[PDB]
Write a protein that binds this ligand. Sequence first.
Ligand SMILES: Cc1nc2ccc(C#CC3(O)CCCCC3)cc2n1-c1ncnc(N)n1
Length: 291
Amino acid sequence: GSHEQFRAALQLVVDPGDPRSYLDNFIKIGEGSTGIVCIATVRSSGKLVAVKKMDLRKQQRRELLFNEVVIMRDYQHENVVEMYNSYLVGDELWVVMEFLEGGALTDIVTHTRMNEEQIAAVCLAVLQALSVLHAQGVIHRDIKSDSILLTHDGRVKLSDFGFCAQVSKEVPRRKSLVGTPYWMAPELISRLPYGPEVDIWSLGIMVIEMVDGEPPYFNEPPLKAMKMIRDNLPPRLKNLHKVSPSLKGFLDRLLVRDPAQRATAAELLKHPFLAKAGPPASIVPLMRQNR
Ligand SMILES: Cc1nc2ccc(C#CC3(O)CCCCC3)cc2n1-c1ncnc(N)n1
């Protein structure tokens, strides 16, 4: 019983019982990597939460469902979406978590143009979370604007660890073709054993998003694009002229074709460009209901 074995394994990691008993008023607010995301009210407290529901029978790699619940279950960090509980409901795994009322970064990078103070602020937060995460040996593996959620007061949180993986002192690196094509590191598309460095490349691609409004090759079909990324040199900004030398210098320590030469999260935190980072209040005017 393959399906049933997965259920039983999951029942060993999730909190027991039916969460529908204590949740009111479900409202769908998105699609995730592995399932859909709703918000609901906690009947007792009146609080709002977000709920990620993943169907066990609808997964390409069902084993990936252990990632968030095993790897992220206890995690806490100012810049990482906080998980509250997990449950098994019918054939679905549910993750109950913090609701980020500000929506995703994607909506901002496709509707406005961020200044450099705001860009560095997003970059600072993400890198802070990546430094701690990469230290514990957790690779996100799907960094992009969709994975960046905001609070009402413009605070930034890393999200959707549905594709994450674990590396250790005994086994660092993965050989897995995971992520979103346009944002994938070259050594990953080249099927090479890769480590945490693939997140830094991806953050670089997200910088291009914040500057150009889209990633490189975004018009090409995903299979073709991955090849162009695999074959060509580090991509160039369509708006290099709107960008300061500092941001360029920053970006250039991220889009290194050589993973060994690519900068690290811990390194990038000390970079001068991040001195431009503004307070979370600087982000607020970019959000939809304010613009
Ligand atoms: C809209 C949306 N899509 C999501 C996909 C994955 C995760 C996710 C996730 C996790 O991987 C984070 C780390 C703990 C385990 C769940 C969260 C998503 N949200 C969302 N969530 C909360 N608020 C808002 N506005 N939007």
